[PDB]
Amino acid sequence: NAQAEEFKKYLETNGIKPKQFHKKELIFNQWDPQEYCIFLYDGITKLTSISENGTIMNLQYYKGAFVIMSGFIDTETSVGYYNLEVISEQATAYVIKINELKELLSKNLTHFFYVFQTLQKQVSYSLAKFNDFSINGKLGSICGQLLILTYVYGKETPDGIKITLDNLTMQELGYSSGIAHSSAVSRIISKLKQEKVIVYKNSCFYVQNLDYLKRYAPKLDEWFYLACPATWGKLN
Amino acid sequence: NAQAEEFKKYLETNGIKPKQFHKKELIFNQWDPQEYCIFLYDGITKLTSISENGTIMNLQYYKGAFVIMSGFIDTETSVGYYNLEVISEQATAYVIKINELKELLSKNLTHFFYVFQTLQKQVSYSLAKFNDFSINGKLGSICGQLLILTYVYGKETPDGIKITLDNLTMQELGYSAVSRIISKLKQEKVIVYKNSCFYVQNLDYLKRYAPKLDEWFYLACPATWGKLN
Numbered sequence: 280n281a282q283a284e285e286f287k288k289y290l291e292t293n294g295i296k297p298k299q300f301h302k303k304e305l306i307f308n309q310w311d312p313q314e315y316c317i318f319l320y321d322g323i324t325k326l327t328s329i330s331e332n333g334t335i336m337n338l339q340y341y342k343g344a345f346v347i348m349s350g351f352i353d354t355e356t357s358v359g360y361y362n363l364e365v366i367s368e369q370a371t372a373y374v375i376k377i378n379e380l381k382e383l384l385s386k387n388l389t390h391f392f393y394v395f396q397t398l399q400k401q402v403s404y405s406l407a408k409f410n411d412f413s414i415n416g417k418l419g420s421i422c423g424q425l426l427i428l429t430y431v432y433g434k435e436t437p438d439g440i441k442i443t444l445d446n447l448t449m450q451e452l453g454y455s456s457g458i459a460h461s462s463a464v465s466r467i468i469s470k471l472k473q474e475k476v477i478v479y480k481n482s483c484f485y486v487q488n489l490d491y492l493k494r495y496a497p498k499l500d501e502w503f504y505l506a507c508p509a510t511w512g513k514l515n
Numbered sequence: 516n517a518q519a520e521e522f523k524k525y526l527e528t529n530g531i532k533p534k535q536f537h538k539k540e541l542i543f544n545q546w547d548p549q550e551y552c553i554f555l556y557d558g559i560t561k562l563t564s565i566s567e568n569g570t571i572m573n574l575q576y577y578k579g580a581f582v583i584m585s586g587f588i589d590t591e592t593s594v595g596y597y598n599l600e601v602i603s604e605q606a607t608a609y610v611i612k613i614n615e616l617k618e619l620l621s622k623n624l625t626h627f628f629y630v631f632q633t634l635q636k637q638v639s640y641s642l643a644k645f646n647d648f649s650i651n652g653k654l655g656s657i658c659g660q661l662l663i664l665t666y667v668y669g670k671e672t673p674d675g676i677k678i679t680l681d682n683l684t685m686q687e688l689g690y691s692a693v694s695r696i697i698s699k700l701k702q703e704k705v706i707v708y709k710n711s712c713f714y715v716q717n718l719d720y721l722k723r724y725a726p727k728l729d730e731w732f733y734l735a736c737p738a739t740w741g742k743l744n
């Protein structure tokens with residue numbers, strides 16, 4: 280990702296060092312008075328919320344490289360009571376107080392544009408997810424999650440599109456945003472397996488019916504085509 | 516809205532003029548290769564997607580003042596095949612080709628940041644809506660929509676907090692598995708349709724079932740939230 284690589288260089292040019300995080304650590308949390316801009320450079324994370332109940336909700340997944348901002352750029356206050364949790368074994372991120380991101384973007388329109396364009400990708404992603412859920416319910420959500428895993432981590436092989444993510448991480452991620460390990464989601468995923476949309480072979484998982492995923496997550500498929508055309512193109 | 520007024524000033528001094536649109540017009544559309552930045556100054560709109568078979572999906576609502584961009588600021592290509600449909604009787608909008616926008620956000624950081632903040636407000640709004648639906652289902656979604664309408668358009672009257680939208684606009688907003696939720700809300704005294712208007716009589720109930728949207732509105736719109744808290 281050339282744009283992201285230039286942004287990493289711009290951060291280091293202004294003296295910002297990478298931090299390392301491990302699975303289950305919070306890169307930012309909902310109780311901190313200070314908000315941050317996170318440039319997630321490598322790894323996989325999830326945005327989480329807590330209900331008055333104490334119940335944790337998984338709201339959104341992010342993978343490096345991407346930008347996640349916990350506060351509004353102008354007011355510097357929280358956009359929501361959210362935590363950013365690491366789900367890969369390790370992650371690398373740049374952690375910038377929001378006031379400082381402002382100074383940085385204001386002196387380079389190219390990098391300003393890069394961060395702005397990430398928010399635009401988020402916005403459209405959410406609408407696409409909403410449209411697919413509206414049409415196909417949880418099946419649409421789950422096919423969309425698998426579709427984006429296929430595009431991002433998939434490699435064509437004789438046995439189909441191999442998902443190149445450790446099995447440990449990959450099973451977690453098959454579960455769409457929402458409550459953790461829902462019974463209903465498990466039964467949707469294993470039904471896709473039973474119908475050989477995604478199959479276990481020689482210790483790996485292979486997507487064998489990409490067209491099925493595309494059929495039930497059509498708006499996320501359009502989203503990926505429009506937002507990430509080269510990655511989309513590889514497998515279409 | 517002072518940030519919105521300052522942005523309006525900056526546009527008009529850079530030659531960009533307000534356009535008036537009537538109900539049902541598309542300020543931008545899903546078949547147009549040219550993408551746009553819309554500064555919706557006044558009125559109510561909805562983002563839609565129309566399928567091959569004619570089915571119209573309602574995806575998002577917006578009210579002036581707000582910013583809606585149909586294209587990516589860097590590539591200038593579509594963010595999704597969407598229309599922006601006017602649902603108020605009239606709307607006023609500043610329509611900027613996306614290539615031209617880049618030049619003007621460049622020369623004024625303050626306005627760049629205003630537009631940037633709008634995207635953040637949309638992102639967090641979508642997440643909050645998702646969160647309330649995950650917790651409380653369709654009841655959460657409907658309470659949330661009623662809650663935001665109460666904060667933004669509500670007027671205190673002897674009959675309760677009247678949602679002061681042109682009746683015609685209320686139909687456009689959706690007012691039959693939904694039909695059974697509205698009836699339940701009337702039965703439990705949470706709302707009433709009196710005469711030609713809509714009245715909220717138990718605001719705590721709405722807040723109860725749309726907690727994450729309420730939190731969103733507190734965080735994003737503190738002055739407005741504060742009028743009824």
Ligand SMILES: Cc1cccc(Cc2cc(=O)n3c(c2[NH+](C)C)SC[C@H]3C(=O)O)c1C
Pocket residue numbers: 323340341342344345400401404424427428431452506507
């Ligand atoms: C690991 C994972 C699985 C499903 C969905 C997502 C969200 C996601 C993936 C993705 O590839 N991109 C985005 C998202 N969302 C944050 C919209 S924004 C554009 C693109 C990118 O990362 O460049 C993930 C991470």
Ligand SMILES: Cc1cccc(Cc2cc(=O)n3c(c2[NH+](C)C)SC[C@H]3C(=O)O)c1C
Pocket residue numbers: 559576577578579580581636637640660663664667735736
């Ligand atoms: C007419 C309407 C009804 C329900 C929900 C919305 C969305 C909405 C309302 C709102 O007041 N605000 C936003 C939205 N969404 C566009 C996030 S962004 C922050 C705030 C504002 O208007 O400044 C609407 C318009």
Ligand code: NA
Pocket residue numbers: 307308309310311313314349357361
């Ligand atoms: Na925080």
Ligand code: NA
Pocket residue numbers: 511512513514515
């Ligand atoms: Na291709």
Ligand code: NA
Pocket residue numbers: 543544545546547548549550585593597
């Ligand atoms: Na368009």
